[PDB]
Amino acid sequence: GVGFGRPDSILTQEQAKPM
Length: 19
Known about the structure:
Blueprint (H helix, E strand, L loop, with lengths): L19
Protein name: Benenodin family lasso peptide
Organism: Asticcacaulis benevestitus DSM 16100 = ATCC BAA-896
């Protein structure tokens, strides 16, 4: 999802890891 430090969903962006 949204954020930084490895992806969720959109595969090559990154996420804050609450998902």
